């Protein structure tokens, strides 16, 4: 795992050179965005459960996936799905703190495709649940912090698609 700063450091390390002006103003961009990321972290950490609650309410309740035969049927599978959305929200918050998607690459999307294919988990309904999380956190934390949270959740969607 690497954040934006250590991603810059490792890229310059493989380049074998010092930090040129591109590294410096990318670092200044991260230092500008850090206060926004901390405030969005505080808001999401305060409303971690409620974001998942309203997202699953507006995405996949009273539908065929919650019907018998659907994969959100039974309390075991329902609570597993809620824990999955909690994982997605927490790791999106981690990636929003980092400014990099390496944590989503190595700790989330690694094996998730064939795991859900082995489990029979509906990929499209999971993606639109993540979209519901995106809309709820965009309405909650603001437009720009919601936009970074949205692009990381859409990175999760594209990795899962």
């Amino acid at each position: 795992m690497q954040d934006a700063i250590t991603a810059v450091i490792n890229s310059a390390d493989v380049q074998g050179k010092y930090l040129d002006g591109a590294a410096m103003d990318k670092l200044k961009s991260y230092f500008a965005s850090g206060e926004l990321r901390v405030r969005a972290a505080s808001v999401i950490s305060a409303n971690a459960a409620t974001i998942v609650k309203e997202a699953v309410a507006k995405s996949l309740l009273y539908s065929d996936v919650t019907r018998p035969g659907g994969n959100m049927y039974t309390t075991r599978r329902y609570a597993a799905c809620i824990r999955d959305l909690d994982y997605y929200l927490r790791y999106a918050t981690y990636a929003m703190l980092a400014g990099d998607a390496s944590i989503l690459d190595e700790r989330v999307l690694n094996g998730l495709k064939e795991t859900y294919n082995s489990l029979g988990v509906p990929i499209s309904s999971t993606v639109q649940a993540i979209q519901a999380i995106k809309e709820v956190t965009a309405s909650l934390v603001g437009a720009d912090a919601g936009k970074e949270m949205g692009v990381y959740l859409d990175y999760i969607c594209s990795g899962l698609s």
């Binding site: 795992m1 700063i5 200044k28 901390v38 981690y94 944590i103 700790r107």
Partner: protein, 160 residues
């Protein structure tokens, strides 16, 4: 970085970041401007640091550039100066990242085994890093010298 450390700690505990960790990230962000100033100072003064530190290193330890030494030839002296350039680049990386994590992960694990296999005097490499610290404190301001000398003394302590 401390952001990476906080995300690792929160992921291992399976929780969101604490407000103390978020305030630590805020303080790191506010100190980032001075840290990038120190990094730009060292990056601009790159070649004179290694030149003056290598000259003072060879003054204090003439045996390594004597014949039969590990760094006698012109190519071997260039390899010495390249190692010092490597450690200066790692010191700038640590100054940017706010911690000793990139220095320790890139060029301080197994450094003793590496220099033992190369036959290189590790105490003289630590003396060289001390000379780099002294030249950096000479040409850089005193508080910036203290912040850079923190990482410099970390490198010296890991070598010694």
């Amino acid at each position: 970085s401390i952001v990476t450390k906080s995300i690792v700690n929160a992921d291992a505990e399976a929780r969101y970041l604490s407000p103390g960790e978020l305030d630590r990230i805020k303080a790191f962000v506010t100190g980032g401007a001075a840290r990038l100033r120190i990094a730009e100072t060292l990056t601009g003064s790159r070649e004179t640091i290694v030149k003056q530190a290598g000259d003072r290193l060879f003054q204090k330890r003439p045996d390594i550039v004597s014949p039969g030494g590990n760094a006698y030839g012109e190519e071997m002296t260039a390899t010495c100066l390249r190692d010092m350039d490597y450690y200066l680049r790692l010191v700038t990386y640590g100054v940017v990242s706010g911690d000793v994590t990139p220095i320790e992960e890139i060029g301080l694990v197994g450094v003793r085994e590496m220099y033992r296999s190369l036959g290189t005097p590790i105490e003289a490499v630590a003396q060289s890093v001390r000379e780099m610290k002294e030249v950096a404190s000479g040409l850089m301001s005193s508080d910036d010298a203290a912040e850079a000398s923190a990482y410099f003394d970390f490198v010296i302590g890991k070598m010694s």
